[PDB]
Amino acid sequence: AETEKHISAGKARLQDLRDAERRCHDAWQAIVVIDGGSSATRTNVFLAKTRSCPRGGRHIDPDSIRLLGAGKRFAGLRGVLESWLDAYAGEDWESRSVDSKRLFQHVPEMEDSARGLMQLLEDDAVRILDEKLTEEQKVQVQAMGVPVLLCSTAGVRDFHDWYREALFVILRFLINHPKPGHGYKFFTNPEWTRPITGAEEGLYAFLALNHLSGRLGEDPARCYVDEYGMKQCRNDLVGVVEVGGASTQIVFPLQDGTALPSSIRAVNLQHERFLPSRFPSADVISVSFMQLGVASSSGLFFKELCSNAEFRHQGICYNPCIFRGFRQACSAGDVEILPDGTIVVDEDVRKNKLKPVATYCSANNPEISFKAMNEIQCRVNKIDPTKSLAERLRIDDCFQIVGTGDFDTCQAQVEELLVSPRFPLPANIEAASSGFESVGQVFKFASTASPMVITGGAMYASISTMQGLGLLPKDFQGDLEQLIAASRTYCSSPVVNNGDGLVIQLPNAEQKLTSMNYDLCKTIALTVSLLQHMEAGEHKPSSISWQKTVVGPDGKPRADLGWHVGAILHRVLFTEEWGRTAYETGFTYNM
Amino acid sequence: AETEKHISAGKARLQDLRDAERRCHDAWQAIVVIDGGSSATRTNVFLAKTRSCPRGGRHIDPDSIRLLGAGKRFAGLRGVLESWLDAYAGEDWESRSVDSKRLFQHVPEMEDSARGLMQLLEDDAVRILDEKLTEEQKVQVQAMGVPVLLCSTAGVRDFHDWYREALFVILRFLINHPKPGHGYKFFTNPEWTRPITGAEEGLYAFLALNHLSGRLGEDPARCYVDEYGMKQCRNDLVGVVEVGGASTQIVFPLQDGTALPSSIRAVNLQHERFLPSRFPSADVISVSFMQLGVASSSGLFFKELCSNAEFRHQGICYNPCIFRGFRQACSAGDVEILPDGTIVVDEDVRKNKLKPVATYCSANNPEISFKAMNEIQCRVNKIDPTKSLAERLRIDDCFQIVGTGDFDTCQAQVEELLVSPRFPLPANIEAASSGFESVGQVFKFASTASPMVITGGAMYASISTMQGLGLLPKDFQGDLEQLIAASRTYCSSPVVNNGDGLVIQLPNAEQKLTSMNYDLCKTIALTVSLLQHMEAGEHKPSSISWQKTVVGPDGKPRADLGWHVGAILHRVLFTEEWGRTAYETGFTYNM
Amino acid sequence: EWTRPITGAEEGLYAFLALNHLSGRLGEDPARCYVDEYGMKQCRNDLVGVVEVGGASTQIVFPLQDGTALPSSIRAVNLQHERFLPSRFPSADVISVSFM
Known about the structure:
The structure is cut from a larger assembly and holds three copies of chain A.
Chain A: H1 5-20, E1 25-36, E2 40-52, E3 58-60, E4 66-70, E5 74-75, H2 77-88, H3 107-132, H4 135-144, E6 146-152, H5 163-175, E7 186-187, E8 194-195, H6 198-212, E9 222-225, E10 231-234, E11 239-243, E12 248-253, E13 267-268, E14 283-289, H7 294-306, E15 316-319, E16 327-329, E17 335-337, E18 343-345, H8 355-360, H9 366-370, H10 373-379, H11 389-393, E19 400-403, H12 407-419, H13 439-445, E20 452-455, H14 457-468, H15 480-491, E21 495-497, E22 502-506, E23 509-512, H16 521-536, E24 544-546, E25 549-551, E26 557-560, H17 563-572, H18 575-585
Parallel strand pairs in A: 1-6, 6-7, 6-8, 11-20, 15-19, 20-24
Antiparallel strand pairs in A: 1-2, 2-3, 2-4, 2-5, 9-10, 11-12, 12-14, 13-14, 16-19, 17-18, 21-22, 22-23, 25-26
Helix pairs in contact in A: 3-5, 6-17, 7-12, 12-16, 13-16, 14-16, 15-16
GO cellular component, one term (chains A, B): extracellular region
GO biological process, one term (chains A, B): nucleoside diphosphate catabolic process
InterPro entries (chains A, B): GDA1_CD39_NTPase (IPR000407), NTPase_alveloata (IPR017227)
């Protein structure tokens, strides 16, 4: 009778072991993406759970990806390359003609320069892993191998010759040789670690948004039978708008009945190898505008507005997009606000809001001497390639830029000079891009009924601070009526010194004036403009929202929006290919 | 022009770093196969290279497979199951009823014995790995994971109910939990570690031999166009006969236009999943006879012979396969020659040459209950299941077996009793088996023209021993007249007890007599019979040879023939499945 | 491939298919899809068994029961592996005999 509980416990012990070799087991794995921006490069550490089953291999559960922590801001890749060329390529490689072949001599100094940055990013990630992982997770993360995807954006896109290509071979090498002591087996390869174009950044933000919000499940959302008796599976994907420092990207789903112009094309994510075949066909419009970045637009707006005699009375340029009370030297240099109230503008050409557009519109750039037309097209944007860097960056006859704080005019100018200029600067043609030259064209010719979300540091903050001010309702959903009324009140607030530094006197608050907010109404105008074009298209988005973080089923944050998790999903959703590259070849390839 | 060698120093560094991420890298990997035989369990350590390319997975180069070393002989699996059963099952459980349900009580005891055996096994592998690997190789082998395939052969086949299946679950659990100290990440799964049938053992031998001969390459050997204008690709594969302790396996390619009896079928290696589909279709004849094989043949022979009145006079049995001057007690027990030459016979049921067959032929076995007809075949081959185990192994009124050293009669009897009985022991029925019951049937109805190679310790010794005495040519290739000539002179030698404990007196030399060679002549008789059928069959093998090791034209030691390499190839040749199970899932699964 | 002699057992496997398809139990989609004790996605068909006793022979073909232990002399016939049913249909494990 007691020799009966011994039988049941023996039957159980056999069953546990049988059970253990039969079901899928899960392991934790870290994935780091290193963001190579213009001004800085910093690491982002992600955690996800892998799963493997007796027969079959190993996959990442995409639903399980969460942001563990972003790191400290370290030096930009541009700034690394620039230090190298300054020290070895001659004093004037930027002005004088470049002799590339003399540089091969100092590749160990570039490699040496890069080892400094890569060591710091490795250490920083290790700081975050150790910090945030449980004891349990750490030993598994160590065992699994940790993928690293280093993707550079705007800062490195301009570098001609072979330099950018050599830096990445160096970079990858440094990543493949982590220090053995900490035990995290970092590895990467030429597919993951690469420069990426603005339009890719856009497609990644698109995959990131739709997956984080559960629109891209394993199963489709609906599968009906169509008007010709055939099964159609569909996902209800959301469209995304992202205004970044260097460029604005817009990516959304195509309508069904929609006639594209010639020269314009819908990019199919499956075809361009951005999403696997087992998800329904995803056709999108996908733009990326270098003029429409926060920074690039500031320099463009300065050149275009202040060259108009309607705004340049008697040596002073009157900018409607800057708060009244703000006085500034007349260039697109880096604004800095001193502790006391002094406003200093940087004269360093590298530290300039027009620098990117101007080095593009250079005699140096082979994209200009390529076709005689793109010289004229950007001379019309008042950036003359035959004239020098200094002449390109400045407005003659201008002593000081003075803030006016007139939203209607600011909005008018932003509309006219940035959103839909009659002659926009060149559209970069590529697999990920649709072809459109600017926003006006997008919603005139290819508008969508799909829901829309707006993203970007300043986009989010400007609305949010208005909401906190009581100027926008707390359930704001994009009503232009309310947005324009709130924008008028906010942007007419004066800048005054009470003794505590420069502030913005709002009706019910004081907001510290920084170099990030002084012209903030330019992007509010840009919001207004953008909501107008969306309202006027044949098809209108079913709803609109502003987002930044996306929260988990548990109620706590999963990840931030943006290209980071898109870069992950691009590799990870391809189960068989990922299985091979991450686990089969993986970190052991480095031995 | 001076530091122009510094430019080429910098060029070369980049190309080297580029080279190092575009090229495939090789990593050393160990696989261990554990041979669970009827009398012992022995670990066998193997070393292979793996290759891994970017935009690809990781595969094993199957040519790089080398035998590193075989281990010590530990306890047979039968043994542990029999110790356990003796301790906890009913006294005389083999005589009595089962009532298996209460045995579950002592699962943790089964787990105790198994852990004892496997940790010896594990340690043994580690001993060999540490000793034979270079330090470079050792680091990679720790990193790669070490596949272990444990395959139980005979001696464990004839256990009923749950006992054997549970042992394997436990076996697997123990392998999947090695000691972290030595860093060899041993692991296994339900597909690798398992009991294998005779016919499988045979199919594995085929693969091993054929791959190690260089006849199973990635490309086919010939490609022609046949009478119907079809593109044909084929491999010129060799056939194998392995005669071992428990059984004898014959596996060879099916001849071009054979008509097989409706009771018999060709085994296709692709369909049954023993060879991948990219290899030319392998149609094969494959048999495993439990009646042949040295131990079981010697039992059955004794029973048939000493029941024939032509060989019995009074209480004496006259065996023509044993040397003149050899006298032993009349039974099938394990012969032992004590230090002074006294031939003594084991009376233990378990150490009995006839125990395996007698275990099969008992009212205990449900395979006998199954077919009221299978009870007849046991009775016909002189093993009545109505009788007890003791009655089954015995011959009444027989007391001494004396050798008559008469090869001609021996051959004749081996022919009549083992090679082609009129009423043979029941066939094995399974996917890997063609369905024949006897060797006579095989070459009468499915002869082949592809070359043949005989493998087996017993088989190799037969030829070798005579070659060492000058009875056969150093270059002997299977000539029948030469063989019988030598065979007569050898077996006709008297054995005399000198001061030296038992010796065979040949015309010009003296050979030691052992428990393993006193009836060698039976298996010489076996050889003669084998070739006789192979010469008499409609199709004739192009050549015939004897082999145990394959060496490689370059230098020496590659691997030993037998099923070990076939166990490996069966899993490893399937590149995409092997990548998932070895590299993606692998040992990380075990955490 | 079409015109050929067929064995009793085939005649039997054909009867199985006919009956099961005509009953509406062999559709393009599986009948049930559940998740078993090991967390694996399972899809199965609820197929019926047939006994046809004819002039020359008698055929019995039915689905193999969930946890049967078969004598080592006996084996289940899988319709996919032997190529009597395509792979997109839930695996059909069957007991199939023809007695002359």
